[PDB]
């Protein structure tokens, strides 16, 4: 009798608002531009599936369209917040070794998980043997870099889809976004860009977790009286 | 259960159909969020094909009218000793200063490049800019 | 009156630079390994320059130095490859230290 009311007031309520967590205020097109999010790889490195997201080529350097980046990022940050609000396990994956330390700190700070190391075969599709029969897999996987260190898609992108785990991913102009659930076209090389992504996803997760605590507390205080 | 056929449909269509068929007893935690706020593209696996024949990529080269001026300035004068500071978002190079002035003199009504180009250089010399020609 | 992305791109300092070959730019040393200096100049990728012998001691993390850019990204396609091989670093020549 009480479970349905609790679920409606807490779990179903946020899903009725377009921007419940107000993630739109975290970034602007100007802030993305100042972080060099629009700078893509050279035209000869272009992936065919990234063409819809490319504004053009400036002297053989692909320029990512930040107007589409903004809409794609809005959806990615919204989805991330709703999952953190729902107490979902979020795993950050990246094989860029320049940012392994930064990403591993960001995960620890927001109370989430990071996998920046060599991805061993079967981590997701054979987890019950690797971790244990009662292991819980991640509910969301955020790829800060979707390519491994031989410029091919990170194996976890395929394995996340096999395990029906939604994926958020920064997809540069040489990446394959076909299997990423919430692709965000943007530069994945410049530290300023990667530092912005980490700030944005860490804030959205922190904001959502606090909102879950506030909403639950109000529901409980009201419940007693 | 779940379907590990990642090349058939998407994670959404597969989950929706299996929950609909009664295979998945409970919807996954993410399902209701996706249904409410779906992505712009449904994540379906596609195979990248090489372009044969006359198929070309629609990506266009980004050019501006002032590139014609910039090209001539760099040919006549070259990159000045002044170093570009790309960290400053409002940095104005000597070339950009020339472009801006050249564009202003065009508003006056000069319709020739040679004369208009020469007049621009003189204005900068009066302002104190150092314009050492390659010659 | 919100600035469009196209407006930002046209006015961006990188756009007005045009071709990068033989363009003198100012970079900052952000990482040092042995004698290798990893310098960021505002592009997509950093460049790696060997510590000059004349005044190696001066070059430290955070020092601003003068570069001559050769290429923003070192890429090339070799026999039988479907895409370019990218080194993920820019090509530049370290001229010296910037002094104001």
């Amino acid at each position: 009798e009480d479970s349905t009311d609790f679920n409606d007031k807490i779990l179903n309520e946020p899903l009725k608002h377009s921007d419940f967590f107000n993630v739109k205020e975290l970034f602007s097109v100007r802030s993305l531009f100042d972080a060099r999010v629009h700078l893509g790889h050279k035209a000869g490195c272009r992936h065919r599936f990234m063409e819809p997201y490319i504004f053009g080529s400036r002297l053989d350097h692909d320029i990512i369209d930040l107007e589409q980046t903004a809409t794609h990022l809005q959806l990615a940050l919204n989805f991330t917040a709703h999952m953190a609000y729902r107490k979902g396990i979020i795993l950050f994956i990246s094989r860029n070794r320049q940012f392994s330390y930064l990403i591993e700190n960001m995960a620890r700070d927001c109370g989430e998980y990071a996998h920046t190391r060599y991805f061993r075969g079967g981590m997701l599709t054979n987890a019950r043997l690797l971790f244990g029969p009662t292991v819980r897999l991640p509910d969301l996987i955020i790829f800060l870099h979707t390519l491994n260190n031989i410029f091919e898609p990170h194996v976890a992108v395929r394995d996340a889809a096999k395990m029906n785990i939604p994926t958020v991913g920064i997809v540069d102009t040489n990446c394959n976004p076909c299997l990423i659930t919430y692709p965000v076209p943007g530069n994945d090389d410049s530290p300023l860009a990667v530092h912005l992504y980490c700030r944005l996803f860490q804030t959205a997760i922190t904001r959502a977790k606090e909102k879950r605590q506030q909403v639950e507390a109000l529901y409980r205080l009201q419940g007693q009286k | 259960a779940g379907s590990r056929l990642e090349t058939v449909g998407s994670i959404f269509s597969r989950t929706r159909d299996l929950v609909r068929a009664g295979v998945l007893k409970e919807k996954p935690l993410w399902f209701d969020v996706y249904d409410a706020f779906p992505p712009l593209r449904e994540p379906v696996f596609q195979r990248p094909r090489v372009r044969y024949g006359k198929a070309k990529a629609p990506i266009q080269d980004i050019w501006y009218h002032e590139d014609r001026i910039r090209a001539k300035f760099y040919s006549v004068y070259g990159s000045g000793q002044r170093a570009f500071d790309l960290f400053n978002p409002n940095f104005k190079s000597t070339c950009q200063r020339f472009v801006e002035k050249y564009t202003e003199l065009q508003k006056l009504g000069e319709t020739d490049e040679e004369k208009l180009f020469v007049e621009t250089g003189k204005a900068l010399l009066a302002e104190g800019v150092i314009l050492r020609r390659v010659g | 009156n919100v600035e469009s992305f196209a407006s930002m791109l046209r006015h961006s300092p990188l756009t007005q630079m045009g071709p990068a070959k033989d363009k003198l730019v100012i970079g900052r040393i952000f990482h040092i390994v042995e004698n290798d200096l990893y310098i960021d100049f505002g592009g997509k990728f950093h460049c790696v320059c060997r510590r000059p012998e004349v005044d190696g001691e001066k070059y430290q993390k955070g020092t601003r130095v003068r570069l001559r850019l050769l290429d923003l990204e070192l890429t090339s396609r070799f026999l039988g490859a479907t895409t370019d091989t990218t080194v993920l670093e820019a090509n530049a020549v370290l001229l010296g230290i910037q002094e104001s």
Binding site: - | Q60, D61, W63, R70 | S4
Partner: peptide, 26 residues
């Protein structure tokens, strides 16, 4: 509309084609 959109041109920075030392000589 907007005036800052890229226009269609031919590469204005394109360098002239290289010529061999005997180009144009009998």
């Amino acid at each position: 509309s907007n005036e800052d959109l890229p226009i269609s041109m031919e590469n204005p920075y394109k360098e002239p084609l290289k010529k061999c030392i005997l180009c144009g000589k009998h």
